[PDB]
Amino acid sequence: TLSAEDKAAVERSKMIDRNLREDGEKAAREVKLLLLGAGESGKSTIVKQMKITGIVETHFTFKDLHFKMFDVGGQRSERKKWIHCFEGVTAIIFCVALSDYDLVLAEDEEMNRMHESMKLFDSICNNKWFTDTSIILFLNKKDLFEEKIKKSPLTICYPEYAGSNTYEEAAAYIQCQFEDLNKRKDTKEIYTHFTCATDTKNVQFVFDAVTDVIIKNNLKDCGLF
Amino acid sequence: MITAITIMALYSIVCVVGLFGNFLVMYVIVRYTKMKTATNIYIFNLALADALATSTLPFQSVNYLMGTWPFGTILCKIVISIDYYNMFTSIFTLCTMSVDRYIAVCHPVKALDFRTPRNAKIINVCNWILSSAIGLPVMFMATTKYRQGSIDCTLTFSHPTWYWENLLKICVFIFAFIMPVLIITVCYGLMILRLKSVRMLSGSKEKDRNLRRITRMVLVVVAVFIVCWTPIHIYVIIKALVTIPETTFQTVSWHFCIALGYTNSCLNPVLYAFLDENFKRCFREF
Amino acid sequence: VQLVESGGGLVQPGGSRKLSCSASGFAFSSFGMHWVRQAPEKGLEWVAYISSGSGTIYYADTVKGRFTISRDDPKNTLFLQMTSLRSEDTAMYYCVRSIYYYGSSPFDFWGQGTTLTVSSSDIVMTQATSSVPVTPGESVSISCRSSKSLLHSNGNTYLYWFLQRPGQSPQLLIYRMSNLASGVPDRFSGSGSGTAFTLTISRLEAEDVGVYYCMQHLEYPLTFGAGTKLEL
Amino acid sequence: QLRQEAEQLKNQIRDARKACADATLSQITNNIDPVGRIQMRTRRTLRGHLAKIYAMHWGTDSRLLVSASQDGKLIIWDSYTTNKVHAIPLRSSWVMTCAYAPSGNYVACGGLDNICSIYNLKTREGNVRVSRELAGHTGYLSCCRFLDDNQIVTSSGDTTCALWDIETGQQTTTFTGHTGDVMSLSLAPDTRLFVSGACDASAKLWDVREGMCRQTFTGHESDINAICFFPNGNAFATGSDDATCRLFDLRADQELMTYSHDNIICGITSVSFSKSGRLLLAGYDDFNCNVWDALKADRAGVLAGHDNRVSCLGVTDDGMAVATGSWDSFLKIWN
């Protein structure tokens, strides 16, 4: 009931099916990491450490695992109408500066960059499209933060910090004040790392967090979870 | 007296919940969910193995009821072949599900490009082929004997009768019981170690609870498999080693052990499928 | 697009010869390929066909099992290995580009050709006429008959018109009974119905001189007409 | 000062519209015969996508369509035989729009890369290759439609539409005036008009030749995600996120009908009309499309069978088929 041309059309569609299945099977092994945070938050440092308008793409490999980074710093539009394109993300790399607690934001000269990053983290954790996906929180500019807390206390950000002005407990307090905003802790794990000049530990943290997410996904697949 | 009626009712109730229990898995694996995943394919294969293993229960129950085999030589040949072969397929699919879960948890990078539906398909295909490679010599070896005026068709051997008996019994004991016990315990133990190490299942009360539930289901799987395939195997081994006197307690203990194995084939779906989160989600979605 | 063949010359009868159409200038792996013969004085007859990806291979019944057709997709090369060459193997071969999807235009590019001279239930297509004396400027109808209705149930009538100018390779004019190929002027137009094939050429010029071939593609093997030679 | 002038001008426009409107569509077509229950079945399922589909566009031949998804593939579908004519590997995986040229010669795609790529389907070399990378937008390309074989009108995430010129690679007209991210545009049959709904809950008509905003339509609540002209080009329906599709009017400039139910609360991603215009289909977010009697504001059918959110919905030119893509990698054709 088919002509020779229809048979060759069907065979061509079958060959295209085979090629598309191969491409999709290759792409399903990729790890999709969504980059969020301000551009002056060490994003250049983390992309150069991971390698060594629109979306810049970063494909890097680390111990037999393929990664993709979708930086959206150039997408200065309403995030509500395009954030649903990132459902299948292994993790969300969320870079937040530490030395922005006392630096006033340029917009309206009244709001602080640390609290704007806190509101960004609120919008990223509490939106519907990111509920069971982990967030690799990064804290940036540790030595600049050390110098700035030597110069001026953390009470100029907010005086709710009851602790003394030392880096370990001050950074612990800012990490806890950033992490306790998470409304759900049974389903989502936030992996906090203080970025370092060493190029191995920064990508090793991402590798470990992504591997933990892959373990959780394989448990969900096998039905044990 | 009515002691043997207890055995006949025992084979019947096991076939009631073994045939219907595994067929409930088949209806929920196509009409509610699909077989798009490796674990769903493995669950369906295990259900097929269990149903085909429990299909012979009326035949051997009426065999014990009227004391002889009235059906037919090729019919009991395929009955003996099917209930050895499906035991082999069921145990091997439990072993390959254990290796699948271990690869999923302990080696996630390799599990990404190994745990695929096509690979699961070819794994269970070669599993059924390998089990057929030992289920077919039983068909080519079984025959019908007439002893003491009655009919019974346990399989007979070649001229080295004792050597072939010992070789077959040692193979079907050692391989298909020691190897799957060892594999399932080492794989589930390493999986429990890695899930102790993981961050999502430790640190909080709910994470500890999730780890507790997973450890509980793994332990009950291993314990149910061992407590069901230990007594009949040890009984067959000691019967081959030494002669046992024939009595009512001996007969009902043999039938109790075989019914225990068939209860394992009955309770494999309720232990592997109904404790899966996919089947749980399909139940809660309706 | 450029398809150039090699491996010709005189051959001893009963010998062997390797043909190779080194395709270039286009995506070779997505195009099905053919070989189409031509007697030194008569018309065309189809030889063999290999699909894209080597899925389906069809042969002419006169050389089924005598010729082997193969492709080398990384090298963009076609092949036709020939064994036990007979007396009716003295002819010349064309490697034909073709493609098959919806709205495609198969049999639309043809190689320059190579010559191989030896030493000493099919739908038959018959061109009713053989030659027409026509001056440049009037409409000409080329009539080709069919032994079976080429109108398939989908609605396509698989008839393929060719124009072989003297000294060069044939090229497509009408594919599937109504549609003009790329580069063909609008003055060419094929129309008609089942087993009745007329190619009307309004405003004939000096470029229409050549032999016109009707081909079927409804089934296999592919059969050409005798050919109508047009001269001024 | 001048803000009060603009406010009183808008009040004058609203008063003029209320003075012009005297009888709603529901009151004037209450006596028409309803379509009743309408049952459509999935004649074809176009499997083959391995990621979430976003946009599809039909063809003028009414047999070929095209669809884009997140696997970096754009497939032309022979919808009669369920075949794959072509499959384009995109350079940018994130695409929310695809367009089919009315000549059937070119196809288009675009998305978060802010670029309206053009591909040539009828290349002499056989393979489908790039012809023009239409750069010049900074926001995400949400819609693109071929004006003709040489022009294309696009809506983007930088609150500006753009009529392009494919033979030079640069725009000829930029349609500015939205106070919000424009999400979808539809082309009129006469090709000299196009409307575009935006995230400021307003759909603004434009003239293609000059770029003046002829009308604005501020009837919705949340933000427009779907838009489609009537077949005669004198109306257009707008699906937005408040679970309401609103019919509009090019001449009267009021909102004609409202297509909302209390059982449905999520918004509309795509809308299309039938050939008669009496059957407006709206692809909702509740995992199924809806069929609306466009003259009675009733519901006549549900195009179920999708396990995820319906993202695109196209009715073919001869009215035969309705191909509905969704997020479950399938397109289902209804007849």
Add this chain to the structure above:
Amino acid sequence: AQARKLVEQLKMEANIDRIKVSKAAADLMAYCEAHAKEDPLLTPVPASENPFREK
């Protein structure tokens, strides 16, 4: 500075004639009544000439 441009856009939008919404809805209804027989979805065509068939 954009206030003047917004005011000019509002006034050039305001300067147009609007037809009655009753007449416009009647025209839409008349189009729907005229193109009724050309709609495969509204009136289900028989499966003989329907290009989408089971096989």
